[PDB]
Write an enzyme that holds these catalytic residues in place. Structure first.
Site, short mmCIF file in Angstrom:
data_model
loop_
_atom_site.label_atom_id
_atom_site.label_comp_id
_atom_site.label_asym_id
_atom_site.label_seq_id
_atom_site.Cartn_x
_atom_site.Cartn_y
_atom_site.Cartn_z
N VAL A 184 0.81 -1.21 0.00
CA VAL A 184 0.00 0.00 0.00
C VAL A 184 0.84 1.27 0.00
O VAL A 184 0.29 2.37 -0.18
CB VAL A 184 -0.98 -0.02 1.20
CG1 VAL A 184 -1.33 1.37 1.65
CG2 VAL A 184 -2.25 -0.79 0.81
N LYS A 243 5.21 2.72 -0.87
CA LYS A 243 6.61 2.43 -1.18
C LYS A 243 7.38 3.74 -1.20
O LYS A 243 6.91 4.73 -1.76
CB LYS A 243 6.75 1.71 -2.53
N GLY A 244 8.56 3.73 -0.59
CA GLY A 244 9.39 4.92 -0.51
C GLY A 244 10.80 4.56 -0.08
O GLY A 244 11.18 3.39 -0.04
N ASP A 249 9.49 15.01 11.13
CA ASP A 249 9.27 14.71 9.72
C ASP A 249 7.78 14.66 9.43
O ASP A 249 7.31 13.87 8.59
CB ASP A 249 9.95 13.39 9.32
CG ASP A 249 10.15 13.27 7.81
OD1 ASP A 249 9.76 14.21 7.09
OD2 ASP A 249 10.74 12.27 7.34
CL1 LIG Z 1 3.79 1.77 10.71
C1 LIG Z 1 2.95 2.69 9.48
C2 LIG Z 1 3.54 3.79 8.85
C3 LIG Z 1 2.85 4.50 7.87
C4 LIG Z 1 1.55 4.11 7.54
C5 LIG Z 1 0.96 3.01 8.17
C6 LIG Z 1 1.66 2.31 9.14
C7 LIG Z 1 -0.34 2.61 7.84
C8 LIG Z 1 -1.28 2.03 8.69
N1 LIG Z 1 -2.41 1.80 7.99
N2 LIG Z 1 -2.20 2.23 6.69
C9 LIG Z 1 -3.06 2.21 5.62
C10 LIG Z 1 -2.61 2.72 4.41
C11 LIG Z 1 -1.31 3.25 4.32
N3 LIG Z 1 -0.51 3.24 5.39
C12 LIG Z 1 -0.97 2.73 6.58
N4 LIG Z 1 -0.84 3.77 3.08
C13 LIG Z 1 0.56 4.01 2.90
C14 LIG Z 1 0.92 5.30 3.60
O1 LIG Z 1 2.18 5.08 4.22
C15 LIG Z 1 2.64 6.15 5.05
C16 LIG Z 1 3.75 5.55 5.87
O2 LIG Z 1 3.43 5.64 7.25
#
Ligand SMILES: Clc1cc2cc(c1)-c1cnn3ccc(nc13)NCCOCCO2
EC number: 2.7.11.30
Length: 291
Positions: free
Chosen positions: A11, A13-14, A133
């Protein structure tokens, strides 16, 4: 344990790594898989979650953390609540807001940031914490409409100064002028809270653009979209923020809406060249509650 998780879809990528939607006992969870280059970010967030019992409705909910390391292989996992609604960055691409949902979002961010910033004393207390950040891509939208803050890998802490040995640095597009011109007082904890307040003001501008007023809205744009290329360099942002002293443009439509005008004033009070003149997280939250 992580042993009972099935990774379903990537979901996010970076440079940090990847975020996957996973399954655990038939429930959705998010799994952040760090690149080995970000080992220190994984550990910081873990000690913040499992050693400081850091919990708040507007901070990403921690489930578990795991590391396995062997010859030729190293895995670093952070397991958290899954938010189907995604990152606020993604969410704002698709959605328009009204008065109630705009303020629910920004008030919920302000509430989580104040909770990070304010120290709590005693047993089951907490040090003061600065994110370092904050951006729309590290804020998640919960089903109830509020947000929660994620990615505490660069946090610094202070009680009555804890800076990591982390070689990763904040997202350049959101770096405060004192970070960009290198006048930031590195040994003063309030500096990091005021770098947070700066980034919050940019996130505030991102959200307000998507609130409709008088049948008008702006498309989603990142901060400084008009003067910087995608993935901007350190030098790109210094020229814009310090030398040219530019700030996000405030579209004329907002001044016709009382709410968007109130947020415009709040925005500007996050963007002073002088960090000391910026609002505190608590004052921002107290203002949003009245607005
Ligand atoms: Cl530990 C973590 C870091 C994070 C995002 C999540 C969890 C997280 C939790 N639920 N969820 C649903 C969609 C999604 N991320 C998440 N989309 C990617 C965005 O990523 C941002 C990175 O930060």
């Amino acid at each position: 344990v992580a042993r009972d998780i099935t990774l379903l879809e990537c979901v996010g990528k970076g440079r940090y790594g990847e975020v996957w939607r996973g399954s655990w006992q038939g429930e959705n969870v998010a799994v952040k898989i760090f690149s080995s280059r970000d080992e220190k970010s994984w550990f910081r967030e873990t000690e913040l979650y499992n050693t400081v019992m850091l919990r708040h409705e507007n901070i990403l909910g921690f489930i578990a953390s795991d590391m396995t390391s062997r010859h030729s292989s190293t895995q670093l996992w952070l397991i958290t609540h899954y938010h189907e609604m995604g990152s606020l960055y993604d969410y704002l691409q698709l959605t328009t807001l009204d008065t109630v949902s705009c303020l629910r979002i920004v008030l919920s961010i302000a509430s989580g940031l104040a909770h990070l910033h304010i120290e709590i004393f005693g047993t089951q207390g907490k040090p003061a914490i600065a994110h370092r950040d904050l951006k729309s891509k590290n804020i998640l939208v919960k089903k109830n409409g509020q947000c929660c803050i994620a990615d505490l890998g660069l946090a610094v802490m202070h009680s009555q100064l804890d800076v990591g040995n982390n070689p990763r640095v904040g997202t350049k597009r959101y770096m405060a002028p004192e970070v960009l011109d290198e006048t930031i007082q590195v040994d003063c904890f309030d500096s990091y809270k005021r770098v947070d307040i700066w980034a919050f003001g940019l996130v505030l501008w991102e959200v307000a653009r998507r609130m409709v007023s008088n049948g008008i809205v702006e498309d989603y744009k990142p901060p400084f979209y008009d003067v910087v290329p995608n993935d901007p360099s350190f030098e790109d942002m210094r020229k814009v923020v310090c030398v040219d002293q530019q700030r996000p443009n405030i579209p004329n439509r907002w001044f016709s809406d009382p709410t968007l005008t109130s947020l415009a004033k709040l925005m500007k009070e996050c963007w002073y060249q002088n960090p000391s003149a910026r609002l505190t997280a608590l004052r921002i939250k107290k203002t949003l509650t009245k607005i």
